[PDB]
Design a protein around this ligand. Structure first.
Ligand SMILES: Nc1nc2c(ncn2[C@@H]2O[C@H](COP(=O)(O)OP(=O)(O)NP(=O)(O)O)[C@@H](O)[C@H]2O)c(=O)[nH]1
Ligand SMILES: [Mg+2]
Length: 254
């Protein structure tokens, strides 16, 4: 009994993409597409979590090149899945990208022109979850001003984004659902380093005026992103099967 899920991370270079995924479950600049895998096996359950790191655009890599290589990768995993399906292989190993975190610079008006290009290049091929990178550069009012616009410009530009399901019908879930739905785009902070924050070493951003904690819900939206991801793996998977994969199958079998 096997379950496989693949997460991709995408966006402008230097937005802390590699740092955040290393932090999810000397850390150099990402030059090519790099996949890392976490295989959990016990009893008769075999979980496979793949994380696809991508080189960001704008520093040594021009945006058109960057999303061409990313699109190429996504279409390849569709290709592979189709081939395994094209003969019967009723039990396949699934490499499709079921979720893509789009990292947005905190320094922008909302989505910069190149971001809109990128997102629209891939929004029909993958579930996009937009995140505000390096949120420790942002005041709470600044976070909120940015969050609104990103959402506004996503609508303005007809950018297709993964939306959460809700209500199967329950109470504790009713809150967590509306909360997570409201806190999008998540403003996140990542850290590769641990700092003595009184009695236990927590990650992890040491400034002379204070310390930023990755896993403090009041500092940033990391745990919210992480729990959103865990608890919605199944929906994200079905949608890429029913909507994104079908549109691939649409064109290639034609
Ligand atoms: N302010 C701030 N800086 C961060 C944060 N996370 C990482 N950084 C810094 O940003 C640097 C670049 O991080 P990195 O994860 O490599 O970014 P990237 O998006 O993967 N870069 P690339 O796309 O070029 O490979 C890190 O070396 C770290 O010093 C964060 O949450 N906040
Ligand atoms: Mg990187």
């Amino acid at each position: 009994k096997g379950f496989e899920f693949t997460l991709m991370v995408v966006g402008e270079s230097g937005l802390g993409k590699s740092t955040l995924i290393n932090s999810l479950f000397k850390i150099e600049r990402t030059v090519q597409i790099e996949a890392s895998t976490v295989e959990i096996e016990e009893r008769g359950v075999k979980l496979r979590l793949t994380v696809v790191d991508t080189p960001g655009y704008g520093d040594a890599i021009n945006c058109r090149d960057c999303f061409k290589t990313i699109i190429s990768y996504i279409d390849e995993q569709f290709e592979r899945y189709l081939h395994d399906e094209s003969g019967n292989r009723r039990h396949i190993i699934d490499n499709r990208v079921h979720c893509c975190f789009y990292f947005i610079s905190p320094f922008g008006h909302g989505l910069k022109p190149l971001d809109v290009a990128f997102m629209k290049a891939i929004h029909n091929k993958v579930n996009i979850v937009p995140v505000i990178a390096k949120a420790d550069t942002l005041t709470l009012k600044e976070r909120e001003r940015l969050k609104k616009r990103i959402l506004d410009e996503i609508e303005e530009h007809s950018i297709k984004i993964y939306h959460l399901p809700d209500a199967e019908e329950d109470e504790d879930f009713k809150e967590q659902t509306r909360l997570l739905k409201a806190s999008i785009p998540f403003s996140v902070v990542g850290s590769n380093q641990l700092i003595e924050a009184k009695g236990k070493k927590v990650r992890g951003r040491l400034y002379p005026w204070g310390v930023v904690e990755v896993e403090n819900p009041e500092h940033n939206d990391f745990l919210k992103l992480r729990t959103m991801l865990i608890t919605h793996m199944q929906d994200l998977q079905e949608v890429t099967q029913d909507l994104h994969y079908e549109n691939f199958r649409s064109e290639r079998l034609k």
